[PDB]
Write a protein that binds this DNA or RNA. Sequence first.
DNA 1: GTCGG
DNA 2: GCTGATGCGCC
DNA 3: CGACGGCGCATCAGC
Length: 326
Amino acid sequence: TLNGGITDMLTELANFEKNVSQAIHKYNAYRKAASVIAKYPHKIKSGAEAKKLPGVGTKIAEKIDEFLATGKLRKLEKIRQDDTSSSINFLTRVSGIGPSAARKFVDEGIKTLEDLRKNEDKLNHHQRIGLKYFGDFEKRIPREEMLQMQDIVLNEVKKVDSEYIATVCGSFRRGAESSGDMDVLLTHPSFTSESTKQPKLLHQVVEQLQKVHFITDTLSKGETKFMGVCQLPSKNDEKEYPHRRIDIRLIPKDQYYCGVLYFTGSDIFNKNMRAHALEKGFTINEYTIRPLGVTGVAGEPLPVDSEKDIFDYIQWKYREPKDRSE
DNA sequence: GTCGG
DNA sequence: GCTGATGCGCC
DNA sequence: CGACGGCGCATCAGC
Ligand SMILES: *CC[C@H](OP(*)(=O)O)[C@H](O)COP(=O)(O)O
Ligand SMILES: [Mg+2]
Ligand SMILES: [Mg+2]
Ligand SMILES: [Mg+2]
């Protein structure tokens, strides 16, 4: 838990700026600072010491001085006592209630868990499922359950078409001991950057996972991205496993490396790496790495035959998945 | 909130 | 219907 | 002082 006090302070400040202030760049600034301090292999003894790290400026240095002197932050003390703030911070924990919906709900007097359950007809489909599994979704998944979930998905995908490849990404591919959810990258040879030679490629997989009662609910679904809910089967007379979030992303098979880089994360690593790419005159998305032309208009996709090729282009030494976490 | 022209 | 803007989601 | 990562799906306004 080294500099755990400081990183917890910065995360709380980030969530405030995101949820209450709707200040996305302040949110990103706080999380970048939190991530760089988490990686620092010494007990920070001063704001001046922290300020030497990239992402920590004058204002974060001053808060760290306050926090090390007093073990708290008066700004955070006040946010915690503010009723609108604490109402908004609570509601934003429901899947599908963002900053705008939370403030809207608070404006209608809907501020608590009881208030939401009374007001189900005021909730869209996503929000109703977020409410139904509120408690379940705050639970982390042990790596042991992630391996059982992997076995069901990979085995069920093989049953639809042996040409599908399914890869579990997110914190699981980074080798975390627990995961917030299950992120699945899907490829099929019939879907490339050049041609969709078969329709319902994602649909057929979702349908098989519904048929064996693994996928239990849908939050959203298009041609390339599924967002839903799944659950491990339980034994005779055992308590049921919690319901879990599942994301499935179908990526063009020739663009697998850009796709697996994106879907492995972490989010903060992606933002740091894409920001660095821009500094080096390249743009990275889940599909391609492209050069920026004279104008600032992206050029043709560069050849990529490995994750490492993307690192090479922007002149970074390769980071294994396990080294891309916070 | 921070960084780099 | 379509297109473009916005909210909320993913890493 | 401008830029800050990039894009999928749901929803709604305007034509
Ligand atoms: C943490 C201190 C703040 O840094 P940012 O530009 O959010 C400001 O210095 C104080 O502003 P406040 O939020 O009005 O206290
Ligand atoms: Mg995840
Ligand atoms: Mg996910
Ligand atoms: Mg995540």
